[PDB]
Amino acid sequence: NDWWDIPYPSQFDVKSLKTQSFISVKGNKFIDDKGKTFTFRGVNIADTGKLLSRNQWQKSLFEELANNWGVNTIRLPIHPVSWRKLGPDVYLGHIDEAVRWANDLGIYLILDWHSIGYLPTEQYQHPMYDTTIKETRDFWRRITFRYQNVPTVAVYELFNEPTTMGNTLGERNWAEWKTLNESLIDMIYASDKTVIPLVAGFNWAYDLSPIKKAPIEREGIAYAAHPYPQKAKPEVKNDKNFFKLWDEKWGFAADTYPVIATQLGWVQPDGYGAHIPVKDDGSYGPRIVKYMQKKGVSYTVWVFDPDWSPTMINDWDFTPSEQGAFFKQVMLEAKK
Template sequence: MKLPLLGAALLALLPLFASAYEPKVAAPAPTDAGEWWNVPYALPFDAKQLTRKQSEVKVKGNLLVDDSGRTVVFRGVNIADPDKLVKQGKWSKAHFEAAKSFGSNIVRLPVHPIAWRSRGSENYLKLIDQAVVWANELDLYLIVDWHSMGNPTKELYFHPMYVTSKQETREFWRQIAARYAGIPTIAVYELFNEPTINSGKLGEVDWQEWKAFNEELISIIYAHDKGVIPLVAGFNWAYDLSQVAQHPIAREGVAYAIHPYPQKSSGPFPEAWEKAWGYLSEKYPLMATEIGWMRADEKGAHRPVISDGSYGPLISDYFAKKGISFTVWAFDPDWPPQMISDWNYTPTGQGKFFREFMLKQAEAEAKTKAVIKP
């Protein structure tokens, strides 16, 4: 059956119309300043920069596993916001090398909303690009953390540096997921650092509302890339996961974040940890993306991080038995509780403890891999 001439002509043009509205990924043409109509689409990260093939880490039941199905436990450090490090002249591959020398296999990048806006997304992404290249060269993985504190459901925040919005948070994760799709070096997206209502000073929140917002963010991320682990925190500064058992996040491949500083519970430990969130590790992967302690007389000591030192052995042993991943706060001499006291990487009390613990764990895992290697 022959189509009318006009109909046939229109059908012939359809591929042209369709392609005209598809985002281009070719190299952008030069544009003059102010030509907003000629601004190119953002390009994905160029994987050709990477020199090492790293395994994709994913969720399987309550475990993290690599491509071969082998269990992965992340142990590492929080560095400072890359924007801060650039301004202090400390943003370099050497900083990542120092983190690895402490036994890290992962580094957490805390991206503050104020830094993201002030530097601009295009320039900030260049910093994350550098982190990906350096981490890949060193066989480290990365956590990208949207580092805000407050109640995003009501858009009330603990301090101006954490002020963001639902829309900015959506857009942040849309850009991150689109740029780094298929890049295993970035293993984890921590959707929101520390949700809190701060004893009602930041409004109220309902778990179902918080759950729905995180599910929305995960859907945006998965539309671009399903090869990452979304990490969801509970309220009370990423400590309260009490609703997860009955109302888990309704998305596949999710892990849960905890920040179990020593004064978050009156103890006794580890019984208090087991009751609050530890039992969930039987069903879901848990990642303690902030842990740490300091003595009351040390610089910057504050609640909830003060301990006499007993916290370190207790929580590291508990995590080892449960297979819980962690990153210690903070591999920076300015942000307490500090792991290093200066830019010569002199370890503090907790820095010395966690360095010895992580190096010992890394050595044991290396021996295990050597034994089972075909």
């Protein structure tokens, strides 16, 4: 009841962590602070609140991924509805856990403000993604203060999937979206310059083409891409044609800036939770990996969860799904 006695916030204790290199942006690539080229390779897990509700929010989940799936990265998709439901303090308290767990295993975190829609009009694909410019600024202000000088937390993914859904959510406008991303970047950099902001384009984070002529005018950033199988629609389905379409929409970005494909994956058209644009016969697997390997692109597969689709696992014993078994072997081999 005494609002005047509500404490000012605290910062994560950097001394609680074991030594871990910082990742940074240099030209079109990520490097570690030993100067060696770095690639984020890993997975999304579900929202922290979803996992807590079935007691699945545990270090054992991070251990499974690091020890058996070859990941060096986990993406945490923080859904705004969950942020509000747990409340900032409780949610950050659990992010703290993820930081200690990831640090101990030598892996990195992407913190993703996981909304879908058009932030300038504050209209969204679904209420679970509902937010405001104000709440979005405040999330990043709180996150940047708390995790200042923390190497484990490597990437701040500002807004998961910008889309206007055919302009039903607003009129998509690059200038307006660019300015808003630059405004978030300035808030972040005023508080911690060692973090990497990750910026997304339109069409559910698929279309980076506006940066050919109007890139975000800030250094040290990377760009997101969500190249699901059915985004590119060539008439003849083969490597060359998919490669050319990927090149035009997002791939070109990797020539100049680092790119993280923070969501990608597939399930069979008659498989679990099959929906556009993630339906595929499986050939997309080797194709997207070949393309990303050629261009040096980083990635986090969606999703290491047995309820959310497309799944990487069929149960909480970690039985791999089709795409799970595929990506698991890709990541284990890349780690070698």
